[PDB]
Amino acid sequence: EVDARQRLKEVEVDDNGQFMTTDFGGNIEEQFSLKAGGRGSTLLEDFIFRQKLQHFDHERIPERVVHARGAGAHGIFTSYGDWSNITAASFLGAKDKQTPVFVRFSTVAGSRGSADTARDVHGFATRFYTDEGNFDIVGNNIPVFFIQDAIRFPDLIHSVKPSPDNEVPQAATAHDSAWDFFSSQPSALHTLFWAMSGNGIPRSYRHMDGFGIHTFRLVTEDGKSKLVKWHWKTKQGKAALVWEEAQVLAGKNADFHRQDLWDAIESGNAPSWELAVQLIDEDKAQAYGFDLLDPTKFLPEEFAPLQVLGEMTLNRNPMNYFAETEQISFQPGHIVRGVDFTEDPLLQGRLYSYLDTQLNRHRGPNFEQLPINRPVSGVHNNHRDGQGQAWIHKNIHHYSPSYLNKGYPAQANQTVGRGFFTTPGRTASGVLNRELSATFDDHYTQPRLFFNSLTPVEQQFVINAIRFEASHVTNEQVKKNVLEQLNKISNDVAKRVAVALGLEAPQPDPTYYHNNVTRGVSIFNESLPTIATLRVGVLSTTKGGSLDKAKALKEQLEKDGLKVTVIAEYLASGVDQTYSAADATAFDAVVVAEGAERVFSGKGAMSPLFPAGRPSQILTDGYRWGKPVAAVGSAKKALQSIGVEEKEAGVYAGAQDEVIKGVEEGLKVFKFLERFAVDGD
Amino acid sequence: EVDARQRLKEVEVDDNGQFMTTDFGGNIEEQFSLKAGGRGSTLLEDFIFRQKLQHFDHERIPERVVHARGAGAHGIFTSYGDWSNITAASFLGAKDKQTPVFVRFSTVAGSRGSADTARDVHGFATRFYTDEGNFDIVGNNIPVFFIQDAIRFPDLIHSVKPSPDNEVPQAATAHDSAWDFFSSQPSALHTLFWAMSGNGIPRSYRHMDGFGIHTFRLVTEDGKSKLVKWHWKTKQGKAALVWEEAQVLAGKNADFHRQDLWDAIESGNAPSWELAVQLIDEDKAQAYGFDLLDPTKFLPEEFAPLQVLGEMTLNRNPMNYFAETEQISFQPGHIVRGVDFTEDPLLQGRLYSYLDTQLNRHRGPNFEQLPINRPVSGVHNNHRDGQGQAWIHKNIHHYSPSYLNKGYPAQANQTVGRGFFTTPGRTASGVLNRELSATFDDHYTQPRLFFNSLTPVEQQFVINAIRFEASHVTNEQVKKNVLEQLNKISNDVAKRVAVALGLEAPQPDPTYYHNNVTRGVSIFNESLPTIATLRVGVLSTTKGGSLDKAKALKEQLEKDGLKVTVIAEYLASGVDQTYSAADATAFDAVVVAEGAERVFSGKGAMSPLFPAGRPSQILTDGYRWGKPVAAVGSAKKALQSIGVEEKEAGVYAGAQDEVIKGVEEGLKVFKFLERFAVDGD
Ligand code: HEM
Ligand code: HEM
Ligand SMILES: *[C@@H]1O[C@H](CO)[C@@H](O)[C@H](O)[C@H]1NC(C)=O
Ligand SMILES: *[C@@H]1O[C@H](CO)[C@@H](O)[C@H](O)[C@H]1NC(C)=O
Ligand SMILES: *[C@@H]1O[C@H](CO)[C@@H](O)[C@H](O)[C@H]1NC(C)=O
């Protein structure tokens, strides 16, 4: 019942019932410039104009170098038990212990203003405002990353982002430079496959799993440690769109995911995730056929099962997007007592990069003093001055060691003051090198494991995604280099992808082929645990009392927890949205109300209120994109017009009571994969 | 025939055949981090990692506060004569006098990653690198602006920009706050009408007119002066898409306009505009029924006809987008000898705003020293120091007046040194006042004049635009305020828009009704003067020798200057694009090659190589959006399947010879408006 943003209330400003003022006080007006005469030039002495305009002119700050496009919200994490047996972290140190949290979801390549539903790796950054400092798990919705060394990050990001000569294409990897890098740097192949699957185009932020990706360390009070992988398990269930749907949705509504997250929290349907961890000993570093320090590899659950530690729930939206969401500054270096890093070369470089990049975004050192960045545990140190210094320090002896300050602020370590400490057992041994380990060399085995662990239709989506993006590559040799690398993962994949490009795939390379499968890498395979907050489009008409029983259909669906929108020609009594403003991409299921066949047919389907064939296009798109479709009573003729029979799965024709039962259980399936063709008939 | 970017060659860096280096020199490698042991931690002493990563972390600069999304290219302006009789401007001082130029086109509301095909006002900024300093004409594609005073600019943008709590919606005025401002501030209504018309969703940057909007002054040698309006008249002709087309295009290709401009210049089809002016005497400032200081008004051509001065041709794309296009700093305050400002309250505030805003973007006062911002005429003054000072000044006596420097750099004015001078005749008179003139009061007459001067179908698109956007407003009273303001402009428009909102705004308010009409405001009325660079989608298939007919059809079509693309199931010999990658929005005309009917029906229409019903949707979308469609020989069956007549206007069935001609004639018509329904059918 405690507010998640309670600490931020002191900095909130209410402008209701007030006069307009300047930033230095004093009441004013700001609707007229000061002029020298009735039709005169504007005066330089006009201080009210310049102070207003100066602030407007300096509103924009630099966007994030990566993950510029994103959205977030506040929440509460609750620990299920006392985890002192495995870690000294205070936020996991007791049963029912609650910690405030802020989570920001994002894409990667796209700039600010780009579409939510573009194919990309997604961000999953979570902060724990704990009683021993801020702890951040900066992660993604895919358990492996492209590159093995952090020094290669600019090379990866330059290649995937728009071509520097024309800045094209926007928020897309479907171009020469991206697929040049994937083929030239074959370690990226694994994350490529995840990005080409359902994880590239998820339904929403709520329907994503999250991963810390890197192997971290969890340290106890006595110094003993264990290797750990972070996992966020979605309670809303995993769900993904189709690509042809995602493209249209990008233009129809670029704010799809952020508005979805916003509407969920406002409607009283706060999304939740369970924090889980894979715990293994130090001596299992190179035990399971790969190196745990390698970020391009994940650990199958068959070797180490998930151990649930707690649950996070996001229940408070921000009041100002910029001040909270845009200004927040996540860091993987934000670590607390009880946790420790590993020698993962990609992770190692991130610790520097995130702290450095805040100097560019916030244009100063004092970015942690911002309300959203502030901890709840207190800040006491000899840091002075800097740009935008918000506090006034009382200790005039800002140094250590010192007699004058009486040894305060004091030093804290493992035994005293509950201070951070590196794992005492950690050792370094060997020559100083600019090399990668020989255990990092395998780039093809896990990609094959991931591809094998998908369903036949899910395997088709990945191949169709590669076909689409690879066909945009103009350079012939680059496409040959791509098929060469795909052939090392799988010959059948390389064969099928080569068909679209009009090239001959190379002969089988059986070095890295295998028939192994792994658990829990699938999406369109498992049904959703709840259909709450899912969207239904009720296609109705203003003419002939069709809207009256469409409202009854809407009323019944809302009881089960569904978000319903009644569509008509114009905004009549009961109509939520017009056909002009309506699209199939904004719904999980399209239902044709009885008496609404007139808008699919001759006279009625060609009204000036909406574009030609708009009602018919919505139902057609919905069916082709695999959504549960329906048609009540005599509305089954609407299905007959588009050419869809009333027998096939995911199509529900009949009485009002039967349609509701069929549509609701159809939403659990979400996508019906039998409507999508597989290679070989 | 000189290179427009000739001066930029000196700062160009070629990295071909060279070894990798740091920014301070010395050859290096940068693909492995320096580790302490084989699987050890990364060392802090690794200077190669940090210097590489630091530059990456600090790559981004703040986007423009408005007009963030844009693109540009270099060119040459050619004056048609000696214009010393009207202006003292050097670049207009002789016949066939060439001056380098850079032009950046843009939207307004959307952020850097937003779509080109969003409905918005479009920027038209042009710089003249003259031999007497840089001269900028920062303009739009619409001749009138929303507000009358520049102090209200933050209020206008804040309302149209995304809502501050959730940052929704992106690149759109279709929300509560925007229409709340338009109704509360009636001055905005005029530009709204232009923004709701074809000017809101233009075909490309090449198919836009440009306007300086403000009344400026042209000054001669002896101090004599004339009021002037700047006009850019396109040689490519005006063209605009439909709304339903632009939405899908925003998702399919967000880089539509910038790729269009890039491909045009790259293919040797450089676009051109004519610089024209409307010259009015000083004593006739308030003679034409409105105040020429009012930015919300435009002057009809029948009162003051256009006088062409020269021609601009953009024929050199940039080599680095960031260095040239992103970094260029336009300002209306960039004025030269022979031009002067007026008492337009909106123009007055811009002079301050544009200079101040560069301090945010560039983080220093030396932004003019950037190669793209540098003038060709030279810089000599007493300005020293500042952030990123790139020069080393030799004059130690950096002040005026002075004996030690002998009075150099020297003062220049009207009579000596060809310096800048304010128009001698300009005067100020009256009380110091924070108010607008009584002559600025009319907000409803010209909006009606614009609506009257459009064609029946164009008038429908404007109403359909208002119908669409007004329905997104959730607040009932705001919609009532909108109709109340629309009713003042036109009763029929208010009533027609009201039916979509599901309420009455009936009772006529005829204070401002009239039937006057003016030339040149319409887009869809005129035919295109050229069909060069216009795109044609050739729907073909890989089976049954249909690709040979498409290849023969391609050459003859591209012979006449068109940009053809052959569509197929996969990349065959003569295939340019796959069906999976293809969409109707990328083409101006669609044509089915002979033998390619199989892909529209039965088994050929359902392949795993492309989404279900893709070939049919491309032809359907093309037809529905008023494009010229066609089919060769037996290909007429493709048109038969979608329910389209062979006879009707813009549809061309028959032999290849009779298809090539007709489609080329149809592209001159561009859009067939008879396919769109009008109110009263
Ligand atoms: C698997 C490893 C990685 C993960 C899980 C990851 C994830 C993320 C996420 C989620 C964000 C957005 C944070 C937010 O919500 O604001 C982000 C931003 C960023 N990333 Fe990474 N990324 C990884 C690799 C890297 C690497 C190797 C580098 C370079 C050393 C890097 C540099 C950055 C920087 C500079 C930002 C901007 C941070 C800010 O402006 O606050 N990332 N990353
Ligand atoms: C009178 C009609 C106006 C027109 C035609 C216009 C045009 C433009 C254009 C074309 C740009 C982008 C320039 C580029 O290509 O880089 C721009 C940006 C900008 N505008 Fe305006 N504008 C108008 C009114 C205003 C007003 C009244 C203000 C406030 C006083 C204003 C403030 C700005 C600012 C601060 C920028 C960013 C400048 C930069 O970062 O380089 N504009 N405008
Ligand atoms: C922690 O600091 C104390 C002094 O405050 C010191 O005696 C002790 O050795 C330190 N702990 C360890 C384990 O190094
Ligand atoms: C596949 O799984 C088996 C488990 O029986 C394991 O022994 C083997 O190393 C895995 N990899 C391959 C390529 O067979
Ligand atoms: C145009 O119509 C206006 C009505 O606002 C009228 O005042 C004016 O005399 C007309 N001018 C002409 C003749 O074009």
Side-chain angles (χ1 to χ4, degrees):
Chain A
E1 19 66 22
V2 179
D3 199 304
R5 328 196 324 98
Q6 185 60 30
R7 68 193 184 276
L8 298 174
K9 292 170 138 66
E10 64 173 18
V11 305
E12 284 176 22
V13 185
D14 184 30
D15 296 332
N16 180 233
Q18 302 293 160
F19 289 101
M20 194 86 69
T21 65
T22 66
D23 291 356
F24 58 92
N27 296 349
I28 62 177
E29 58 182 311
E30 35 82 275
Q31 295 302 305
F32 304 97
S33 296
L34 188 62
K35 307 175 190 67
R39 295 158 78 257
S41 300
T42 302
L43 299 176
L44 188 61
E45 62 173 44
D46 189 4
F47 71 95
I48 298 180
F49 163 78
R50 283 184 291 97
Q51 66 94 37
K52 178 172 174 186
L53 270 292
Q54 176 165 117
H55 204 272
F56 173 79
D57 294 339
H58 291 248
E59 279 185 14
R60 302 290 176 276
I61 67 183
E63 74 182 30
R64 296 164 168 78
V65 65
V66 290
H67 299 251
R69 177 68 190 190
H74 296 253
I76 302 298
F77 173 78
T78 307
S79 184
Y80 286 166
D82 190 342
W83 306 109
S84 54
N85 63 326
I86 59 174
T87 183
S90 187
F91 82 101
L92 296 172
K95 184 185 173 63
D96 306 329
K97 187 170 182 177
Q98 295 189 167
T99 302
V101 296
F102 190 90
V103 180
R104 186 175 180 282
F105 305 94
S106 60
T107 62
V108 160
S111 301
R112 283 182 62 243
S114 58
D116 281 329
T117 61
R119 184 181 296 285
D120 206 347
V121 177
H122 288 76
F124 202 131
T126 308
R127 169 171 286 161
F128 299 88
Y129 297 88
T130 77
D131 55 54
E132 303 187 355
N134 288 355
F135 177 57
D136 290 357
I137 299 178
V138 182
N140 291 328
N141 75 323
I142 296 172
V144 295
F145 203 70
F146 295 99
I147 54 170
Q148 299 180 319
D149 198 313
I151 197 170
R152 300 168 177 174
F153 191 70
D155 298 306
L156 170 64
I157 296 297
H158 283 157
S159 71
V160 301
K161 276 178 181 280
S163 185
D165 57 343
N166 64 356
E167 197 164 76
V168 173
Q170 179 58 217
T173 56
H175 52 111
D176 290 52
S177 58
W179 291 84
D180 181 30
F181 185 81
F182 304 145
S183 60
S184 299
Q185 193 74 74
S187 58
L189 290 168
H190 195 199
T191 302
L192 212 185
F193 270 56
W194 282 85
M196 292 295 151
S197 74
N199 295 54
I201 46 173
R203 169 54 176 77
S204 69
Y205 299 140
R206 300 184 292 102
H207 300 74
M208 297 195 300
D209 279 349
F211 304 95
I213 301 187
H214 304 299
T215 301
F216 286 90
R217 282 189 168 83
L218 291 179
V219 186
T220 62
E221 311 297 357
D222 56 35
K224 292 162 68 64
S225 60
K226 277 187 172 61
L227 303 176
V228 66
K229 294 283 197 189
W230 298 104
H231 292 260
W232 285 113
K233 286 281 146 171
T234 180
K235 304 293 284 182
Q236 290 77 238
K238 283 188 285 179
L241 305 172
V242 300
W243 175 241
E244 57 266 34
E245 178 185 7
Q247 284 191 304
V248 176
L249 183 49
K252 294 284 181 176
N253 190 12
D255 307 275
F256 188 70
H257 291 156
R258 65 174 59 189
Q259 190 152 40
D260 179 77
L261 180 61
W262 188 276
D263 293 5
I265 294 177
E266 289 295 320
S267 61
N269 295 303
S272 59
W273 294 259
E274 273 188 344
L275 186 59
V277 290
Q278 290 179 288
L279 300 170
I280 60 286
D281 290 341
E282 294 272 40
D283 60 10
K284 307 298 193 301
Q286 298 156 111
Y288 309 117
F290 68 94
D291 200 329
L292 278 167
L293 302 173
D294 192 357
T296 66
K297 312 282 189 298
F298 69 86
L299 185 61
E301 293 175 26
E302 288 80 19
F303 304 128
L306 292 164
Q307 201 170 139
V308 179
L309 303 180
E311 191 189 41
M312 180 178 66
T313 304
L314 301 174
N315 51 205
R316 301 284 172 172
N317 286 323
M319 288 198 71
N320 191 240
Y321 181 95
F322 179 87
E324 296 171 56
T325 311
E326 188 68 15
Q327 279 191 146
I328 193 169
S329 293
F330 289 95
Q331 294 187 226
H334 282 162
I335 190 166
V336 298
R337 182 198 176 81
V339 193
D340 198 10
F341 311 113
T342 61
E343 292 81 355
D344 180 315
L346 191 65
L347 176 58
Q348 289 282 314
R350 289 177 68 190
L351 299 178
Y352 163 82
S353 180
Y354 283 64
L355 190 65
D356 175 48
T357 194
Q358 305 311 323
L359 299 171
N360 192 48
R361 285 181 57 219
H362 293 285
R363 208 186 172 181
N366 283 312
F367 48 91
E368 302 284 35
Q369 297 188 337
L370 295 171
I372 195 64
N373 292 322
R374 286 183 71 184
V376 304
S377 59
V379 177
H380 307 97
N381 57 40
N382 298 138
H383 296 199
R384 296 296 183 265
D385 300 359
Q387 211 72 70
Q389 174 56 234
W391 311 331
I392 295 180
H393 299 277
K394 294 182 73 174
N395 183 25
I396 58 155
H397 296 117
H398 52 329
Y399 58 97
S400 182
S402 177
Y403 165 81
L404 295 167
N405 64 24
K406 309 345 223 265
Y408 295 113
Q411 304 292 300
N413 57 9
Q414 191 183 176
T415 63
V416 183
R418 290 192 63 83
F420 178 92
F421 62 100
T422 293
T423 306
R426 270 213 280 182
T427 61
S429 65
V431 67
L432 302 178
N433 65 106
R434 273 167 172 87
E435 288 165 28
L436 279 171
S437 182
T439 56
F440 281 55
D441 292 345
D442 198 329
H443 309 295
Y444 309 94
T445 303
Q446 292 220 341
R448 177 57 177 273
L449 182 62
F450 172 73
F451 187 79
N452 292 6
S453 302
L454 293 170
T455 63
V457 178
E458 281 180 303
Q459 288 178 335
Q460 189 69 48
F461 293 143
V462 178
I463 291 172
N464 289 4
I466 291 173
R467 283 166 156 183
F468 174 84
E469 295 216 345
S471 65
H472 290 77
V473 180
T474 59
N475 191 277
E476 180 79 336
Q477 186 56 227
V478 175
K479 286 183 285 186
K480 290 178 177 177
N481 294 169
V482 174
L483 292 170
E484 190 180 49
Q485 298 298 147
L486 288 165
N487 189 54
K488 294 181 187 300
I489 299 178
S490 176
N491 180 231
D492 192 42
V493 175
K495 274 171 60 168
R496 295 154 84 183
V497 173
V499 178
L501 301 176
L503 295 171
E504 299 190 268
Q507 298 296 124
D509 193 356
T511 302
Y512 300 111
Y513 301 161
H514 63 92
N515 307 144
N516 292 357
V517 295
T518 188
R519 178 206 307 156
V521 305
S522 281
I523 316 193
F524 304 82
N525 172 47
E526 316 196 333
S527 62
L528 281 59
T530 180
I531 68 179
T533 79
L534 292 184
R535 288 156 163 78
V536 181
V538 180
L539 302 176
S540 188
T541 181
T542 57
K543 321 196 149 13
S546 173
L547 197 64
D548 255 25
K549 39 179 162 180
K551 153 84 183 180
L553 180 56
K554 166 166 176 188
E555 189 182 0
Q556 224 32 59
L557 290 166
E558 284 183 350
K559 269 153 184 44
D560 202 40
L562 298 166
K563 192 180 187 302
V564 184
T565 307
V566 178
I567 313 303
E569 290 91 336
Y570 60 92
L571 268 55
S573 183
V575 183
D576 298 309
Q577 195 179 229
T578 51
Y579 278 113
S580 184
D583 194 62
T585 58
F587 304 115
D588 307 336
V590 183
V591 183
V592 182
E594 188 170 28
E597 309 97 62
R598 61 181 304 285
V599 304
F600 288 83
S601 74
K603 237 232 181 106
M606 52 183 68
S607 185
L609 297 168
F610 53 87
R614 175 53 54 88
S616 182
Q617 189 65 49
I618 288 170
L619 189 64
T620 303
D621 286 344
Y623 171 73
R624 246 100 95 169
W625 297 334
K627 303 175 183 291
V629 292
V632 187
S634 62
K636 73 196 176 177
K637 36 165 109 199
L639 295 171
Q640 313 176 349
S641 67
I642 64 173
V644 180
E645 287 185 10
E646 311 72 36
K647 303 93 172 185
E648 58 181 312
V651 182
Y652 313 100
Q656 183 174 129
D657 66 276
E658 296 185 4
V659 174
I660 291 169
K661 185 167 177 292
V663 167
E664 286 170 351
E665 72 190 40
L667 286 166
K668 283 196 177 297
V669 177
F670 195 73
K671 256 83 176 67
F672 290 85
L673 300 174
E674 46 260 286
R675 302 171 190 174
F676 298 88
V678 189
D679 289 318
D681 296 21
Chain B
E1 16 70 6
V2 70
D3 195 332
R5 322 198 320 102
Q6 182 67 51
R7 71 197 184 272
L8 273 52
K9 259 68 172 295
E10 67 185 315
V11 302
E12 289 190 314
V13 183
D14 189 11
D15 293 332
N16 183 221
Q18 298 292 159
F19 283 102
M20 276 275 189
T21 68
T22 62
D23 293 319
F24 59 92
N27 295 7
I28 59 178
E29 42 145 354
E30 32 72 283
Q31 292 287 314
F32 300 94
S33 298
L34 183 58
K35 303 169 190 69
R39 301 161 65 255
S41 306
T42 300
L43 297 179
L44 181 60
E45 64 169 71
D46 188 0
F47 72 93
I48 300 178
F49 169 81
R50 282 186 289 94
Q51 68 92 43
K52 184 182 177 183
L53 271 290
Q54 190 182 68
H55 205 278
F56 172 82
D57 296 335
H58 294 245
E59 281 187 14
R60 301 287 174 281
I61 67 181
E63 71 177 33
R64 297 167 171 79
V65 64
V66 291
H67 299 258
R69 178 67 184 182
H74 299 249
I76 299 297
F77 172 82
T78 304
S79 182
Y80 286 154
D82 189 350
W83 308 107
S84 58
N85 61 329
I86 55 174
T87 181
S90 191
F91 77 102
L92 297 169
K95 188 168 182 66
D96 307 325
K97 188 172 184 172
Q98 293 191 174
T99 302
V101 294
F102 189 89
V103 180
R104 185 177 178 281
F105 309 93
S106 57
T107 60
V108 181
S111 293
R112 275 181 66 255
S114 57
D116 287 322
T117 57
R119 186 180 295 283
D120 206 348
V121 178
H122 298 263
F124 203 132
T126 305
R127 167 171 284 161
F128 296 93
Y129 296 92
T130 74
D131 60 344
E132 300 189 348
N134 287 341
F135 176 61
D136 296 359
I137 298 177
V138 182
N140 288 347
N141 76 317
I142 298 176
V144 299
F145 201 70
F146 294 102
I147 56 173
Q148 294 178 317
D149 199 309
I151 199 169
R152 310 181 194 188
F153 190 73
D155 297 302
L156 170 60
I157 298 297
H158 283 202
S159 64
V160 305
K161 285 277 177 172
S163 182
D165 58 347
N166 61 0
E167 199 168 88
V168 175
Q170 183 60 213
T173 56
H175 52 110
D176 289 47
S177 62
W179 290 86
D180 181 33
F181 184 83
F182 298 140
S183 56
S184 301
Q185 195 72 277
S187 64
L189 291 171
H190 193 195
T191 304
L192 216 179
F193 268 55
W194 282 84
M196 293 291 96
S197 75
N199 296 50
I201 46 173
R203 165 60 175 80
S204 68
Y205 300 141
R206 305 187 288 96
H207 303 78
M208 296 191 308
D209 287 358
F211 305 92
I213 299 182
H214 301 301
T215 301
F216 289 96
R217 279 179 162 80
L218 287 173
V219 185
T220 64
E221 293 288 295
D222 60 352
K224 285 185 190 180
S225 71
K226 283 191 171 61
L227 298 172
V228 64
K229 293 283 199 187
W230 294 112
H231 292 255
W232 284 111
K233 307 297 290 187
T234 183
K235 303 305 301 187
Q236 292 75 233
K238 288 188 287 180
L241 305 176
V242 299
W243 174 240
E244 54 265 41
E245 177 181 357
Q247 281 189 312
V248 175
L249 183 50
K252 290 284 173 177
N253 182 19
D255 300 281
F256 185 69
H257 291 160
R258 63 173 63 191
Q259 185 75 78
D260 180 78
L261 180 54
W262 188 272
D263 292 7
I265 296 179
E266 198 69 38
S267 67
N269 300 293
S272 299
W273 295 260
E274 278 180 333
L275 188 63
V277 293
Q278 293 182 315
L279 296 168
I280 311 86
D281 296 320
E282 291 290 350
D283 62 337
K284 295 175 189 66
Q286 309 179 233
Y288 306 106
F290 66 93
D291 204 325
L292 281 171
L293 299 173
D294 201 329
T296 64
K297 309 286 195 303
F298 71 83
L299 182 60
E301 293 181 33
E302 34 268 295
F303 285 112
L306 297 170
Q307 296 179 43
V308 60
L309 299 173
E311 198 184 60
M312 175 170 63
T313 305
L314 303 173
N315 54 204
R316 304 287 173 175
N317 285 327
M319 277 202 175
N320 194 254
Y321 182 93
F322 186 87
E324 291 165 67
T325 303
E326 187 66 32
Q327 273 190 331
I328 189 167
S329 293
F330 285 99
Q331 310 175 216
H334 287 153
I335 198 170
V336 299
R337 176 179 167 83
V339 187
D340 193 17
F341 307 115
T342 63
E343 291 80 0
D344 186 325
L346 191 64
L347 181 61
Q348 293 285 310
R350 289 177 77 194
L351 301 185
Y352 165 84
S353 181
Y354 282 67
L355 189 65
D356 175 51
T357 195
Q358 307 309 145
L359 300 175
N360 194 51
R361 276 185 53 205
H362 298 286
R363 298 184 165 173
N366 290 314
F367 50 82
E368 301 283 24
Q369 298 188 329
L370 294 172
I372 194 63
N373 294 322
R374 282 188 72 173
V376 303
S377 58
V379 179
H380 303 280
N381 58 36
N382 297 141
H383 297 194
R384 301 293 184 279
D385 303 4
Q387 206 84 81
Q389 176 56 236
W391 310 332
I392 302 179
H393 298 81
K394 299 177 74 63
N395 183 27
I396 65 181
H397 306 103
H398 57 324
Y399 55 93
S400 308
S402 175
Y403 165 81
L404 296 173
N405 66 32
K406 305 184 174 293
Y408 291 98
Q411 303 292 303
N413 63 26
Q414 173 164 214
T415 58
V416 60
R418 306 208 74 190
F420 183 92
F421 67 99
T422 294
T423 306
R426 270 213 288 183
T427 58
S429 187
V431 64
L432 298 178
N433 71 118
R434 279 180 166 86
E435 23 200 56
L436 267 54
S437 182
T439 52
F440 282 58
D441 288 348
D442 197 346
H443 315 299
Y444 307 97
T445 299
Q446 293 217 345
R448 178 61 179 283
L449 186 62
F450 171 74
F451 188 83
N452 285 344
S453 299
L454 292 169
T455 62
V457 185
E458 279 174 306
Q459 289 174 3
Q460 190 69 55
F461 295 140
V462 177
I463 291 179
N464 284 16
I466 293 172
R467 279 169 158 178
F468 172 89
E469 291 205 345
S471 67
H472 290 73
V473 181
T474 58
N475 199 92
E476 177 173 2
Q477 190 57 222
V478 176
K479 288 179 285 187
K480 288 178 178 176
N481 294 169
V482 172
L483 293 174
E484 184 175 309
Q485 294 295 133
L486 285 172
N487 191 51
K488 294 171 184 295
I489 298 179
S490 172
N491 184 227
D492 191 26
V493 175
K495 82 176 359 139
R496 283 163 65 172
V497 173
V499 70
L501 301 177
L503 39 53
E504 346 131 53
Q507 217 60 35
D509 185 16
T511 305
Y512 292 108
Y513 298 164
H514 65 91
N515 303 140
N516 278 24
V517 184
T518 181
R519 304 198 309 258
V521 306
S522 58
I523 299 183
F524 296 86
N525 193 23
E526 298 191 54
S527 299
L528 301 176
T530 181
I531 61 174
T533 76
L534 291 183
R535 277 134 178 167
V536 183
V538 179
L539 281 67
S540 187
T541 182
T542 59
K543 309 186 194 178
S546 179
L547 201 65
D548 292 351
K549 297 192 184 180
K551 250 185 294 163
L553 182 60
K554 180 172 178 181
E555 188 163 303
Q556 273 288 353
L557 196 63
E558 289 204 331
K559 282 274 267 149
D560 298 300
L562 293 168
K563 195 273 207 306
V564 186
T565 310
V566 181
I567 312 301
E569 294 93 333
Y570 59 87
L571 269 53
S573 184
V575 181
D576 298 309
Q577 196 177 229
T578 54
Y579 272 116
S580 175
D583 192 66
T585 57
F587 309 111
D588 306 332
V590 180
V591 54
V592 182
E594 187 171 21
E597 320 98 43
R598 57 179 305 285
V599 303
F600 286 77
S601 61
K603 298 154 100 143
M606 45 174 64
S607 184
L609 292 166
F610 52 88
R614 174 55 55 90
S616 299
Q617 192 67 47
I618 290 176
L619 190 64
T620 300
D621 284 349
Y623 174 84
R624 216 93 78 174
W625 302 331
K627 302 182 188 293
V629 299
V632 186
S634 60
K636 52 181 257 1
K637 186 199 120 195
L639 302 171
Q640 206 179 311
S641 62
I642 61 172
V644 177
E645 264 70 46
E646 298 174 21
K647 154 189 212 178
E648 65 180 312
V651 182
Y652 310 99
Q656 186 187 133
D657 296 33
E658 300 180 3
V659 168
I660 287 169
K661 297 185 184 244
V663 168
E664 287 170 12
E665 293 182 1
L667 284 164
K668 291 192 178 296
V669 181
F670 188 77
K671 225 69 154 166
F672 286 87
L673 305 179
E674 47 262 281
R675 306 186 198 182
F676 300 91
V678 191
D679 291 326
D681 292 341

